[PDB]
């Protein structure tokens, strides 16, 4: 990857972690935002708005880091 091509591979692996987890609370909020985030990347193009969705992936990533 380089920019966008690498983005899709980042969240895709991000799911294998949650899907393997369990319990409510922090896992709940991270779930709804997890999938909705992906579909947002499909609508995106090459640049511009790609910066916004990028921040959406940065929030859920750092989140699971603690839980």
Q: Is residue 4 a contact residue for ligand HTS (CB under 6 A)?
A: no
The alpha carbon dihedral of 44, 47, 49, 50 has a sign of positive
Measure Cα distances from 26 to 3, 11, 23 in Å.
28, 17, 8
Rounded distance between C-alpha atoms, residue 61 and residue 10, angstroms: 9
CB of 65 vs ligand HTS, minimal distance in Å:
14
Output the smallest distance, CB 17 to ligand HTS, in A: 7
Residues from 30 through 59 that contact ligand HTS (CB under 6 A): 31, 34-35, 38
Residues lying near ligand HTS in the complex (CB under 6 A):
11, 14-15, 18-19, 31, 34-35, 38
């Amino acid at each position: 990857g380089s920019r966008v091509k690498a983005l899709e591979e980042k969240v895709k692996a991000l799911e294998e972690k949650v899907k393997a987890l369990g319990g409510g609370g922090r896992i709940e909020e991270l779930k709804k935002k997890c999938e909705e985030l992906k579909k947002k990347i499909e609508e995106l193009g090459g640049g511009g708005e790609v910066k916004k969705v990028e921040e959406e992936v940065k929030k859920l990533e750092e989140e699971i880091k603690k839980l």
